[PDB]
Design a protein around this ligand. Structure first.
Ligand SMILES: Cc1cc2nc3c(=O)[nH]c(=O)nc-3n(C[C@H](O)[C@H](O)[C@H](O)COP(=O)(O)OP(=O)(O)OC[C@H]3O[C@@H](n4cnc5c(N)ncnc54)[C@H](O)[C@@H]3O)c2cc1C
Ligand code: HEC
Ligand code: HEC
Ligand code: HEC
Ligand code: HEC
Ligand SMILES: O=C([O-])[C@H](O)C=C([O-])O
Ligand code: NA
Length: 568
């Protein structure tokens, strides 16, 4: 058979998958996926049949309930979503090679016919607030607006929830939390504010940073009340004290937070629509929001009538063409991002009259795995790993800010470096076992053997770790002035991960005020239009601190949902 439907129809009727009249149920394909599940089992049940030692197409780190049709289309060959970041050896029936070619908002102007028809029609729904994007900011806005008495529709353009937020590792920054106090950590919102402003080269809007620092404990409390575990508190770069909150043992914060948000949205019966892209914010004759034109992948264009629209669409770090025009030093770099993080939400914001700011400030994460092409968490360094070059020497304070760390790594021989750590570090950070599972953390019982394995000077490496451990013992790094030396690298075996910078986060975006209201170039509020999360500019300035993006998206998403509900 040339496609999945053709295979099935050999001994099944059309209505084995389809509704009675044949119409597709909705853009989430709810009815149709339910039919797949009726015969094949849930995703977890299918996964039992497709195990590999170190990976499983049907059991991944993605949170929520991942629809079968995310990867298996019926009437045409389809792509494995995992192929957008990994190259696992898969044999999905009716597969085709991964290729993302999504039309820009500007290109969709070609749908002049179809869009005019939609807008000429009755609104498909009439609600209070539409939230665009199912990352942490969008789910937070949808939940908060719903709890404030608003009727919400949440849309997501991708087939799966969670955006980049589901990928978050190292943590959510906050001070001064119960969780920190329980771990004998002393902090303050003031110190978080100070670290943040300094970290951003004082480019950040201080009014927005004050919201970030002052609301941070409340946001940790809010997540925790919803069921999140944020009890482990680690160190990230450019921070005065440990304040990156994450689940027990140092497991990934992002999948967890997104799962909690998803479960809470399902509990509230929030209308979530997948494969549904926000295209154009609609405004009335006085320039206030009146709704939004969307494009359903399966059901076509339609509009929703609403008082408020909350853009929670994330960044553009996947779009290297747009990135390179703003910061040429990042041209041709690999990205840490999900395939849809291309900035189409900003185009929607600008078309609605929103001004952008700080667009030139784009962060490279200092440590993408060269072998795996995925982010390796800064928490590996926070929990005690060092960086060495091919000469086997330290060369940077491994917990400095990301601008400085990235530059340092790029300055080394081969424009890459190695994370080096032992089993004490490994055991301290649950997330590290994921890199071992991915195959990107080669190991040996001596540094000489590891060095020979990886092309690092083995004797120099050995002497480097001895010297470093000496500095840990004496309590002062006189070589690179690293201010926190949590662990000696001296238990069990040693690991190396080859790392290099990758494009990671866009600090610029739509201009908002402290109420998450989008403003035009005249600094005038556009009534009914809100922005929250990485889509906004002004929060992070010239360099974002690790841990501060998850803090941002929960704080600003929650605030936006409450403000939108009040606005009405
Ligand atoms: C691998 C990785 C690890 C990270 N780790 C951390 C960490 O631990 N700590 C931290 O603070 N930050 C971390 N970050 C940064 C942080 O996760 C991102 O800043 C965060 O995901 C921003 O969340 P968001 O809700 O604004 O956007 P996202 O989570 O990216 O969600 C936006 C969603 O909107 C969608 N969308 C876009 N346009 C449209 C449209 N027109 N219509 C409908 N939907 C649309 C997307 O497809 C996406 O699903 C990490 C980022 C990555 C990539
Ligand atoms: C909804 C769109 C789906 C999806 C994503 C899949 N199916 Fe089915 N399927 C059914 C049976 C009896 C078979 C033969 C194998 C078996 O005995 O279990 C299949 C086969 C598949 C495949 C493999 C195709 C190939 O080329 O070998 C795949 C990838 C698959 N399915 C996914 C039974 C049913 C149903 C019962 C009436 C329904 C409904 C579906 N399948 C729908 C779907
Ligand atoms: C499950 C395995 C299916 C079988 C068997 C049939 N269809 Fe299907 N159909 C299915 C899905 C998941 C979808 C969405 C797109 C995709 O290919 O994944 C569709 C789509 C259609 C459409 C398009 C409808 C539209 O664009 O509005 C049509 C016209 C259609 N399907 C017809 C159809 C007929 C006549 C079938 C029996 C021969 C049939 N389908 C089988 C899932 C499945
Ligand atoms: C992408 C992330 C997928 C999603 C979501 C679902 N499936 Fe899948 N499927 C995918 C791959 C890459 C493969 C090949 C796996 C491999 O290890 O090579 C498959 C395979 C199947 C199969 C065939 C299994 C077999 O016995 O050989 C089936 C029957 C199947 N998938 C069904 C299925 C259903 C019902 C899903 C929703 C619950 C579903 N898949 C999700 C990729 C992805
Ligand atoms: C980029 C946006 C990704 C996509 C798409 C998928 N994964 Fe992933 N994966 C990504 C990262 C940054 C990491 C590093 C470890 C971490 O948890 O942050 C990984 C790791 C894995 C691993 C190894 C660890 C583990 O969970 O066992 C596996 C087996 C894995 N990823 C599988 C996987 C599958 C099956 C996916 C499709 C459903 C998938 N990944 C998508 C980033 C990204
Ligand atoms: O390194 C991480 O875990 C991460 O990627 C941290 C942030 O904030 O972006
Ligand atoms: Na931004």
């Amino acid at each position: 058979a040339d496609n999945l439907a053709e295979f099935h129809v050999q001994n099944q009727e059309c209505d084995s998958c389809h509704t009675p009249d044949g119409e597709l149920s909705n853009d989430s394909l709810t009815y149709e996926n339910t039919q797949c599940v009726s015969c094949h089992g849930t995703l977890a049940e299918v996964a039992e049949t497709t195990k590999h030692e170190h990976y499983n197409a049907h059991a991944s780190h993605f949170p929520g309930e991942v629809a079968c049709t995310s990867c298996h289309s019926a009437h045409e060959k389809s792509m494995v979503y995992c192929d957008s970041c990994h190259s696992f050896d898969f044999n999905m029936p009716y597969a085709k090679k991964w290729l993302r070619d999504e039309p820009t908002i500007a290109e969709l102007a070609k749908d002049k016919s179809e869009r005019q028809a939609a807008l000429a029609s009755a609104p498909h729904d009439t609600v209070d607030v539409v939230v665009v994007g199912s990352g942490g900011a969008g789910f937070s806005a949808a939940i908060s607006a719903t709890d404030s008495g608003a009727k919400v529709i949440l849309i997501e353009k991708e087939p799966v929830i969670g955006g980049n937020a589901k990928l978050a590792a190292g943590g959510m920054n906050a001070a001064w939390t119960d969780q920190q106090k329980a771990k004998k950590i002393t902090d303050s919102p003031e110190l978080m504010f100070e670290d943040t402003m300094k970290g951003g080269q004082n480019i950040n809007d201080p009014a927005l940073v004050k919201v970030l620092s002052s609301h941070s404990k409340d946001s940790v409390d809010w997540m925790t009340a919803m069921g999140a575990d944020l009890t482990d508190v680690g160190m990230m770069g450019g921070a005065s004290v440990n304040r990156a909150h994450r689940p027990t043992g140092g497991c990934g914060v992002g999948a967890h937070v997104v799962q909690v948000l998803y479960d809470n949205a399902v509990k509230r019966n929030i209308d979530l629509r997948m494969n549904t892209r926000g295209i154009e914010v609609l405004k009335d004759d006085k320039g206030t929001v009146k709704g939004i034109l969307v494009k359903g992948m399966y059901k076509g264009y339609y509009w929703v009538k609403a008082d408020a629209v909350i853009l929670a669409t994330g960044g553009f770090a996947k779009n290297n063409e747009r990135v390179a025009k703003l910061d040429p030093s990042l041209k041709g770099f690999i990205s840490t991002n999900q395939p849809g993080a291309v900035g189409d939400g900003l185009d929607v914001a600008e078309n609605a009259g929103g001004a952008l700011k700080d667009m030139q400030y784009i962060q490279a994460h200092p440590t993408l795995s060269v072998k795996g092409g995925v982010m390796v968490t800064e928490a590996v360094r926070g929990n005690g790993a060092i960086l060495v070059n091919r000469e086997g020497k330290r060369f940077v304070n491994e917990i400095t800010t990301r601008d400085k760390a990235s530059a340092a790594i790029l300055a080394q021989t081969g424009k890459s470096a190695y994370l080096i750590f032992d089993d004490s570090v490994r055991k301290s950070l649950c997330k590290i076992d994921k890199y071992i599972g991915l195959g990107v953390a080669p190991t040996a019982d001596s540094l000489v053997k590891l060095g020979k394995m990886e092309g690092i000077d083995g004797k120099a490496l050995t002497e480097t770790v001895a010297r470093y451990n000496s500095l840990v013992s004496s309590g002062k790094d006189t070589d690179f002035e690293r201010p926190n030396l949590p662990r000696a690298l001296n238990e069990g075996n040693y690991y190396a991960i080859e790392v290099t910078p990758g494009v990671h986060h866009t600090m610029g975006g739509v201009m908002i005020d402290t109420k998450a209201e989008v403003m035009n170039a005249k600094k005038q509020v556009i009534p009914g239009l809100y922005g929250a999360g990485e889509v906004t500019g002004g929060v992070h300035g010239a360099n974002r601190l690790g841990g501060n993006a998850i803090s941002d998206i929960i704080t600003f998403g929650r605030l936006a949902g409450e403000e939108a509900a009040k606005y009405s």
